[PDB]
């Protein structure tokens, strides 16, 4: 069934699984027309498909040309997402295909199920978690490759950098969701925390700074403070 607090360690067992987040697939700016009406202009988007055990991120860039001449784009975006995830699975060797796909939004269940009819043994699951994957476009290197794309493109990343050399996948996913939750709640503050000390750099082949274990504890503490803070600034507590 659904994925929640009670069955959280399942994410880090040895059954291959993928989260799929479609938040950033169909992205628009809303603006006024010369006649004073409102219109949208699409910008490039992305599917966020993540193996939480390994940190492997399959970032399928959705170029604005995929929307040209199409209607009901928010509905189409869910089906396009499911088309691209099914295509990804088919592209992987059998022994690398997932045994479950967890969608971060329930509206992806029927599109994905229909596109995966050929894979009756891959379970399509919703989740009761409010995961912060929409904030993936607050990671500068990911935003940069999405905005620069001139055509459909798949970009492969490890969203944990080298962290699994020193920590478990449970701890790595916890750090990731903490960073993304912070970026989602107060992007400016979060980014200030991460870059404040110019001596800690981001390796060319990495997404996040090269913190020592001790510095990650400090950073993680600052991200927690931020999230509670903004939670007061928002709620007055």
């Amino acid at each position: 069934g659904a994925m929640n607090s009670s069955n959280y360690a399942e994410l880090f067992n040895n059954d291959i699984k993928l989260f799929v987040d479609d938040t950033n697939v169909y992205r628009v700016t809303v603006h006024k027309t010369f006649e004073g009406n409102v219109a949208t202009k699409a910008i490039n988007g992305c599917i966020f498909t993540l193996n939480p055990k390994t940190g492997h991120l399959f970032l399928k860039i959705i170029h604005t040309s995929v929307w040209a001449g199409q209607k009901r784009l928010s509905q189409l975006a869910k089906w396009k997402t499911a088309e691209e995830v099914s295509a990804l699975v088919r592209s992987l060797p059998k022994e690398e295909q997932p045994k479950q796909i967890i969608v971060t939004r329930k509206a992806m269940l029927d599109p994905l199920e229909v596109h995966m009819l050929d894979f009756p043994n891959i379970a399509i699951r919703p989740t009761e978690l409010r995961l912060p994957f929409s904030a993936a476009m607050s990671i500068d290197k990911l935003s940069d490759v999405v905005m620069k794309a001139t055509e459909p493109q798949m970009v492969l990343f490890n969203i944990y950098d080298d962290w699994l050399d020193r920590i478990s996948s449970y701890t790595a996913f916890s750090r990731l969701t903490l960073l993304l939750r912070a970026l989602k709640t107060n992007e400016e503050s979060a980014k200030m925390i991460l870059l404040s000390d110019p001596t800690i750099t981001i390796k060319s082949y990495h997404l996040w700074p090269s913190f020592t274990d001790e510095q990650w504890i400090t950073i993680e503490s600052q991200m927690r403070d931020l999230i509670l803070t903004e939670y007061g600034r928002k709620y007055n507590v």
Binding site: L76, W79, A82, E83, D110, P111, E113, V114, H115, L117, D118
Partner: protein, 300 residues
Amino acid sequence: MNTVPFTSAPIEVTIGIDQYSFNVKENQPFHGIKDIPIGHVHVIHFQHADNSSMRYGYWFDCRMGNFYIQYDPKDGLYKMMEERDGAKFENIVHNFKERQMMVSYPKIDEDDTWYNLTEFVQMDKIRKIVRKDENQFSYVDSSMTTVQENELSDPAHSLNYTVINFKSREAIRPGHEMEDFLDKSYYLNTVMLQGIFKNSSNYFGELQFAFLNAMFFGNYGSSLQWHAMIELICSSATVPKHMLDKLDEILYYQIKTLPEQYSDILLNERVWNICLYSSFQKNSLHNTEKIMENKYPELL
């Protein structure tokens, strides 16, 4: 006008014939039903006074043979049987009529209800849904499961309705995933009408039979089939104009006939709201929408 004689009525029972019903007391001198209209299928059905559990009955067509009812004290039910000796049967029936021991099928002359509920229902199709080829009549009861229900356990006692599943390869063409899921016309017109049912008359016949088994026996798998066959048409953007007009008439008479006190269970809120107010055909069922709104505005 044909007759279904009863050998006797040894246990107290409510007997239905089509949409009618009457009470027979234990050992009451009852010997059957006469004046049954020729030209339609019929159903004779039973609910024992002691065990209102298990409604059961028999679908038959008096043009296909001489049928009678006889209680079996071993299996504990009223059984339909065929009498092959035609002179014996006419003699039995003539004697029961002379002694006035039969009820009369109580049809009002103005009244087209049964025709309207069974317009496309044929015995030969019933007998393919209900497989028991050594008899010309078909037994159904409250508990019998459908082929599709069994896939999700005794095959000989199953209702072999056509399986309809909207998230299936049969329903979804590779590469038209979104198109075929959101507009089911392919599945309706090519897979089901042209491919499986052959024509809309056989489609409507199965839909009508499923509804009647749901209504008369409380058969849950039958109710599922009835709603699936409605939803498949309503969720198709492209439906022959004559099918939509006929569907409105079919559903009108089904809703008209449904006991008011059984709508809570026999009507699926999601299907009807989707069909009358959201689907492609939301504006094509005027008669059905009007009777539904006046009779079950709560469900909606």
